[PDB]
């Protein structure tokens, strides 16, 4: 994921986080992804293009 | 203030014992209670007290309910020969009569 | 998950559901408990950070312990914070491995071992005495805090013989707990972190600024070679929407 | 307070029952105040019971002015059913000013409701009682006319006053400069008020507590307590 | 005074107070010092070491600062250290000795006997002779599970050492409180100097946090709050003041006039010796209200008089001093009720100043402004109001 030039910071998580709200098993992985500022992405390449 | 009192009377110990035995779980559990402005724990010889203080204007009985909401998760975790008593429904001004 | 009708008060529902929680405590196994949920919703997740080490000095276990027993007990001091939840890292466990050949050589089961272990990690009461008028209470030791202390434990006695020590049958060490939740940055490496919740129906910007300045002032006392790295914050989206709406109104 | 206002009225009007007005106008206001508290609790503490003693003195002025003007206009008409109608006219010619003044002296107590705290919530009930009593008395003064219609010396006062008024009017700027001098000299007590703010409430009972060290036995404590009680 | 002078026993510092106040103070589990520094840490040694420096670090900054670290280190504990090796040498676990420590020496409870509704505890302990002195404890007979008759000193060593008497925990963490306080001054700027000093010159240990608190904090809000509302309230006066005159000049005149009665009222506390407070503020509010009443009412009479016959002559050519006669006939109709009000107020409020019943010093504090201002507000109205009125064009 980080190979893409537009992503700035990633954070992967698997399982729960010692809280009652989360119930993710050891296989469900949730990856938060922060994108670079719109002015700095690339020529064009809207959000749909990124996804 | 509007606050709740929790007491636990052990016959005889040292303040460190009750501190690391009875006060630590109560405080660590009540730290996550709603409306908590600040928790305080006094460890004394034999007996230990806990004062929970909330914001002003809140309902006292609502605070009692919310603080009891986290009191059952520590009963079994507490030693057998002890218990956790709650405070009355009054303030320091409650002392009205006194006789001998 | 207990679901009620709409429009009802959340705290009233909490009270009513706790009304039937005490009738099952004693009915529940001993080595377990029943914890309740926080005072927030899925939207409560507001902030998210990770503890990175730009070196190979500290281990994941140290970072996990720091995040569990130093920061968690400080961020929650903020009034409007629902709760903070740790994630990732390693839970240092004092694990004791056994050797069945030794158990056979000495012929001892495991229940006796459990009993011995449950009778060697506590102190006694110290009711005082009436010595000289400067009163003088008592206190005993008995807390297990050293591996050398773990090695000096009795399992069965042999009058006029030699008592069997734990070191002769087993081996103690420190290791990782059975992991159920892991976290990681980009391919840099594994890390531990925390997530912040928000009380249902409260301002965000305030608590975000509070936690931000708190981490700023706390970075000083932080150990060497450790850094905080944020990953999620609603404040950006909030201010972006505010600016967009203000510009639309102005035009 | 009631008896002194009554004797003052009887002195300045030579045995007129106008005093009754006060006695049937100031107490009723109190009632209204209490009624309000019943709709929101606010048990009567000592501060609330104290503030009314000053509220009554702050409120009596409206009734005083009303009865004075009414008697004045009546004595004026003496120089020459509808009589009481023109009395009511002479009362309403000044009514609205008194109503607005009572409303403003009522609403001037919000800064007390603003602050909140141990002392803030101690004082709150006082200001609440104050404002409610002022509003009640405003209403009563608006309806104090029926009880009103139901029922030598000042020459010296005017003789002493009028020459002073004639003397001062020719020098107004001097009065303004005197006011400036007053608002200047006021600064001296302001900077040296002292201290010991929020005094303590005295009581016929007392409680003694000595600061002492922790170490103490079960018999030494009893012996010391008995010795102190005997002393 | 006679009591404090009579009772004097060594080791005590007397205090005499009201019972209810003492109770509600006892119950207040907060910091009473105007300034307080809370240092939180994972252990006691680190926080104590930090506070040791913080003491003199705060003592250095200007402003009287009674730097008190703590007063809890006054306990007295036995330290019976269980040599686990020696206990194992006789086939005894820790608990096997902890039991003797609890019951044979302490006298733990074992159960309650019933006598109807009354439950009475049951104790179990050794005699009082074997548990009198530490030397007597070093010879405490013990019977091992294998029936080996030994003493306590054969498995453990007892030592003497002091310690705490009570422990405070804020947020489930060891915390030490340092009290600092000045008097007759607002400590609004010293806090910044103190925090910057402790941050620049005093290092922090990993696992230690510092925070400030005290009365000062709440003040920073209270003042602010009133500093936000008092203006608006004053505006609520303006809008409500000219409703009887429909012109701004009159309301502005009354607003600039009330401070005269304010000064008249405040000048009394010097003679009486009292000190301002919130209640004195409420008294000031009431005095200002009555002064505004006087001013409004006199202004109504002046406006009714100027609208008389001279209303046609004064605009004719110029002043025509004769117009002052109007004011004459405009003022004679006001001295009587004003004097009546002043007399009744003074004669009703005097005994409260000169009386002591139940909660009377307070009532005197609240009544002083009225008695002090009722000597100027009447003069104010009678004299300065018509002057400014004639000076209003
Ligand atoms: Cu006390």
For C113: left if phi > 0, alpha if psi spans -120 to 50, otherwise beta; the answer is alpha
CA distance to E91, E132, E147, per residue, from E150 (Å): 12, 19, 9
The answer to whether chain D touches chain E by having 3 or more C-beta pairs less than 8 angstroms apart is yes
Q: What are the residues whose beta carbons fall under 8 Å from the beta carbon of B66, sequence distance 6 or more?
A: B33, B34, B35, C11
Residue E114 has phi, psi (to 5 degrees) of: -110, 140
CA distance to D117, D137, E137, per residue, from D130 (Å): 19, 11, 70
Contact E265, E370 (CB under 8 A): yes
D116 touches B at CB < 8 Å: yes
Six-digit token string for C136: 């003088």
Six-digit token string for D20: 């009754």
Using a CB-CB cut-off of 8 Å, the residues of chain D touching B44 are none
Closest residue in D to B1 (Cα) is D118
C140 touches E at CB < 8 Å: yes
Residue D146 has phi, psi (to 5 degrees) of: -65, -45
Longest dimension (CA), chain A: 43
Exposure letters B33-46 (e unless 16+ CB within 10 A, then b): bbbbebbbbbbbbb
| CA–CA dist E363, E365 (Å, integer) | 5
Pairs of CB atoms within 8 A across C/E: 116
E213 half-sphere exposure, CB direction, 13 A CA radius = 12
Residue D127 has phi, psi (to 5 degrees) of: -65, -35
Pairs of CB atoms within 8 A across A/C: 71
| CA–CA dist D229, D216 (Å, integer) | 18
Six-digit token string for C203: 């301002």
Question: By three-state DSSP, how is residue D65 classified?
Answer: helix
> Are B45 and C137 within 8 A, CB to CB?
yes
Q: Given 3-state DSSP classes, what are the helix, strand and coil percentages for chain E, each rounded to the nearest 5?
A: 50, 15, 30
CA distance to D147, E16, E278, per residue, from E34 (Å): 56, 22, 19
> Are B40 and E77 within 8 A, CB to CB?
no
Return the axis-axis angle of helices D172-185 and D154-169, rounded to nearest 10°. 100
Ligand 1 centroid to E14 CA: how many Å?
12
Q: What are the residues whose beta carbons fall under 8 Å from the beta carbon of E157, sequence distance 6 or more?
A: E80, E81, E83
Contact E386, E323 (CB under 8 A): no
Ligand 1 centroid to E26 CA: how many Å?
5
Q: Give me the residue from E21, E285, E387 closest to D168, CB to CB.
A: E387
- CA-wise closest residue to E91 among E136, E140, E154: E154
D212 touches C at CB < 8 Å: no
Return the axis-axis angle of helices D46-77 and D2-13, rounded to nearest 10°. 10
The answer to whether chain D touches chain A by having 3 or more C-beta pairs less than 8 angstroms apart is no
Q: Give me the residue from E20, E29, E106 closest to B51, CB to CB.
A: E29
| CA–CA dist D56, D64 (Å, integer) | 12
Six-digit token string for C125: 């009461």
Within 10 A of C138 (CB to CB), how many other CB atoms are there?
25
| CA–CA dist E298, E288 (Å, integer) | 15
| CA–CA dist A18, D63 (Å, integer) | 72
| CA–CA dist E313, E323 (Å, integer) | 9
Closest residue in E to D194 (Cα) is E275
Experimental method reported for this structure: cryo-EM
D160 half-sphere exposure, CB direction, 13 A CA radius = 6
Within 10 A of C232 (CB to CB), how many other CB atoms are there?
17
Contact E340, D68 (CB under 8 A): yes
Ligand 1 centroid to B13 CA: how many Å?
23
In DSSP terms, E161 is beta-bridged to: E77
| CA–CA dist E359, C184 (Å, integer) | 68
Ligand 1 centroid to E73 CA: how many Å?
19
Length of chain A: 51
> Are A11 and C231 within 8 A, CB to CB?
yes
Neighbours of chain D (3+ CB pairs under 8 A): B, C, E
D229 touches B at CB < 8 Å: no
Using a CB-CB cut-off of 8 Å, the residues of chain C touching D221 are none
| CA–CA dist E256, D179 (Å, integer) | 10
> Are C181 and A18 within 8 A, CB to CB?
yes
Give residues 2 to 41 of B whose Cβ lies within 8 Å of E: 3, 11-12, 14-16, 19, 23-24, 27-28, 31, 38-41
- CA-wise closest residue to E71 among E85, E51, E57: E51
Pairs of CB atoms within 8 A across D/E: 267
Burial grade of D79 (CB within 10 A; 0-12, 13-18, 19 or more) = exposed
> Are A32 and C48 within 8 A, CB to CB?
yes
Q: What is the dihedral of CA E108, E114, E120, E125, to 10 degrees?
A: -30
The DSSP string of D112-147 is: HHH--SHHHHHHHHHHHHHHHHHHHHHHHHHT-HHH
Rounded to a whole number, what is the distance in Å from the CA of E40 to chain B's nearest CA?
A: 13
Resolution (angstroms) stands at: 3.4
- CA-wise closest residue to E378 among E320, E334, E347, E344: E334
Ligand 1 centroid to A40 CA: how many Å?
67
Contact C156, C164 (CB under 8 A): yes
Rounded to a whole number, what is the distance in Å from the CA of A41 to chain C's nearest CA?
A: 17
Question: By three-state DSSP, how is residue E275 classified?
Answer: coil
Exposure letters E119-158 (e unless 16+ CB within 10 A, then b): eeeeeeeeeeeebeebeebeebebebeeeeeeebebbbeb
Return the axis-axis angle of helices E335-353 and E360-373, rounded to nearest 10°. 150
Question: By three-state DSSP, how is residue C111 classified?
Answer: helix
Within 10 A of C229 (CB to CB), how many other CB atoms are there?
15
C137 touches D at CB < 8 Å: no
Six-digit token string for B9: 């009377």
Contact C141, E82 (CB under 8 A): yes
Ligand 1 centroid to E300 CA: how many Å?
60
| CA–CA dist E8, C203 (Å, integer) | 57
Sign of CA dihedral A8, A13, A18, A24: positive
Closest residue in C to D216 (Cα) is C135
| CA–CA dist D164, E378 (Å, integer) | 14
> Are C134 and D220 within 8 A, CB to CB?
no
- CA-wise closest residue to C40 among C218, C228, C207: C207
> Are C135 and E90 within 8 A, CB to CB?
no
């Amino acid at each position: 994921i980080m190979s893409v030039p537009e992503v700035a910071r990633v954070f992967g998580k698997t399982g729960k986080a010692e809280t009652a709200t989360d119930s993710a098993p050891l296989e469900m992985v949730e990856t938060t992804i922060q994108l670079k500022p719109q002015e700095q992405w690339r020529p064009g390449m809207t959000m749909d293009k990124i996804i | 203030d509007v606050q709740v009192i929790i007491k636990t009377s052990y016959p005889g110990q040292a303040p460190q014992i009750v501190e690391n035995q009875v006060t630590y779980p109560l405080t660590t559990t009540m730290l996550s209670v709603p409306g908590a402005k600040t928790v305080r724990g006094f460890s004394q010889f034999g007996d230990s007290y806990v004062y929970v203080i909330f914001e002003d204007g809140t309902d006292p009985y609502w605070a009692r309910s919310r603080v009891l909401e986290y009191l059952n998760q520590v009963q079994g975790k507490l030693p057998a020969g002890v218990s956790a008593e709650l405070g009355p429904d009054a303030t320091g001004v409650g002392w009205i009569y006194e006789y001998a | 998950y207990v679901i009620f009708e709409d429009g009802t008060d959340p705290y009233w529902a909490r009270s009513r559901v706790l009304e039937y929680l005490n009738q099952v405590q004693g009915k529940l196994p001993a080595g377990v408990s029943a914890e309740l949920g926080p005072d927030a919703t899925g939207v409560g997740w507001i902030y998210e950070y990770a503890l990175v080490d730009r070196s190979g000095k500290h281990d994941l276990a140290d970072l996990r312990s720091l995040q569990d027993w130093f920061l968690k007990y400080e961020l929650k001091t903020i009034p409007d914070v629902a709760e903070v939840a740790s994630v990732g890292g390693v839970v240092k466990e004092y694990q004791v491995v056994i050797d069945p050949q030794r158990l056979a050589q000495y012929g001892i089961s495991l229940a006796e071992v459990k009993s011995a272990l449950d009778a060697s990690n506590q102190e006694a009461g110290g009711s005082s005495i009436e010595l000289a008028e400067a009163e003088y209470m008592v206190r005993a030791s008995g807390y297990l805090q050293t591996l050398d202390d773990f090695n000096h434990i009795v399992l069965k006695a042999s009058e006029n013989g030699v008592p069997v020590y734990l070191r002769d049958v087993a081996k103690v060490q420190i290791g990782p707990e059975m992991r159920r939740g892991i976290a990681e940055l980009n391919g840099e490496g594994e890390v531990a972190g925390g997530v912040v919740i928000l009380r249902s129906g409260k301002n965000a910007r305030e608590v975000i600024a509070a936690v931000k300045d708190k981490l700023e002032t706390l970075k000083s006392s932080l150990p060497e070679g450790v850094e905080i790295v944020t990953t999620y914050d609603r404040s950006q989206l909030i201010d972006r929407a505010i600016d967009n709406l203000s510009g639309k109104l102005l035009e | 307070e009631f008896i002194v206002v009554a004797v003052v009225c009887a002195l300045f009007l030579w045995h007129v029952r106008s005093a009754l007005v006060a006695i049937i106008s100031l107490p009723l206001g109190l009632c209204i105040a209490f009624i309000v508290m019943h709709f929101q609790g606010l048990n009567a503490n000592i501060m609330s019971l104290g503030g009314i003693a000053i509220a009554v003195g702050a409120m009596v002025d409206a009734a005083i002015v009303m009865i004075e003007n009414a008697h004045k206009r009546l004595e004026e008409w003496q120089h020459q059913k509808t009589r009481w109608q023109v009395i009511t006219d002479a009362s309403v010619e000044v009514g609205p000013a008194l109503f607005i003044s009572l409303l403003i002296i009522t609403l001037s107590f919000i800064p007390i409701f603003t602050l909140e705290g141990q002392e803030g919530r101690l004082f709150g009930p006082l200001a609440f009682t104050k404002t409610y009593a002022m509003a009640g008395a405003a209403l009563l003064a608006i309806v104090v006319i029926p009880i009103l219609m139901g029922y030598p010396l000042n020459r010296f006062l005017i003789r002493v006053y009028h020459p002073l008024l004639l003397k001062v009017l020719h020098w107004p700027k001097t009065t303004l400069l005197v006011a400036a001098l007053s608002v200047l000299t006021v600064l001296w007590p302001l900077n040296k008020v002292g201290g010991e703010f929020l005094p303590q409430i005295n009581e016929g009972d007392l409680l003694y507590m000595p600061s002492t060290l922790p170490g103490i036995s079960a018999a030494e404590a009893a012996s010391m307590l008995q010795k102190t009680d005997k002393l | 005074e006679e009591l404090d002078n009579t009772v004097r026993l060594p080791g005590l510092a007397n205090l005499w107070v009201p019972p209810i106040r003492n109770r509600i103070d006892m119950l207040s589990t907060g910091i009473k010092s105007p300034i307080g520094i809370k240092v939180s840490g994972t252990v006691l040694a680190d926080i104590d070491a930090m506070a040791e420096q913080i003491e003199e670090v705060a003592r250095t900054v200007p402003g009287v600062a009674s730097a008190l670290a703590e007063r809890l280190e006054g306990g007295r504990y036995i330290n019976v250290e269980i040599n686990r090796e020696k206990a194992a040498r006789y086939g005894m676990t820790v608990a096997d000795v902890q039991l003797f420590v609890t019951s044979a020496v302490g006298g733990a409870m074992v159960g309650e006997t019933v006598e109807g509704i009354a439950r009475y505890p049951i104790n179990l302990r050794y005699p009082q002779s074997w548990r009198d002195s530490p030397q007597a404890l070093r010879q405490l007979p013990i019977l091992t599970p294998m029936k080996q008759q030994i003493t306590l000193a054969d498995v453990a060593d007892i030592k003497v050492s002091t310690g705490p008497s009570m422990l405070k925990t804020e947020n489930a963490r060891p915390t030490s409180w340092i009290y600092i306080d000045a008097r007759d001054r607002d400590m609004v700027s010293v806090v910044h100097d103190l925090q910057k000093a402790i941050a620049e010159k005093v290092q922090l240990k990993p696992g230690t946090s510092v925070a400030f608190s005290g009365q000062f904090e709440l003040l920073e809000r209270a003042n602010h709050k009133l500093k936000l509302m008092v203006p608006m309230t004053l505006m609520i006066i303006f809008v409500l003041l000219y409703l009887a005159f429909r012109r701004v000049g009159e309301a502005l005149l009354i607003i600039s006039s009330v401070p005269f009665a304010l000064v008249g009222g405040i000048w009394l506390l010097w003679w009486m010796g009292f000190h301002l407070s919130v209640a004195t503020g409420t008294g000031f509010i009431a005095l200002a209200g009555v002064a505004a009443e006087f001013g409004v009412v006199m202004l109504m009479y002046l406006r009714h008089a100027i609208e008389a016959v001279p209303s046609l002559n004064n605009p004719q050519t110029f002043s025509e001093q004769k117009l002052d006669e109007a004011l004459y006939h405009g003022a004679v109709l006001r001295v009587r009720p004003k004097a009546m009000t002043v007399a009744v107020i003074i004669a009703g409020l005097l005994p409260i100043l000169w009386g002591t019943g139940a909660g009377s010093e307070v009532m005197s504090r609240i009544a002083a402004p009225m008695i002090g201002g009722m000597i100027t507000a009447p003069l104010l109205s009678l004299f300065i109001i018509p002057a400014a009125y004639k000076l209003m064009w």
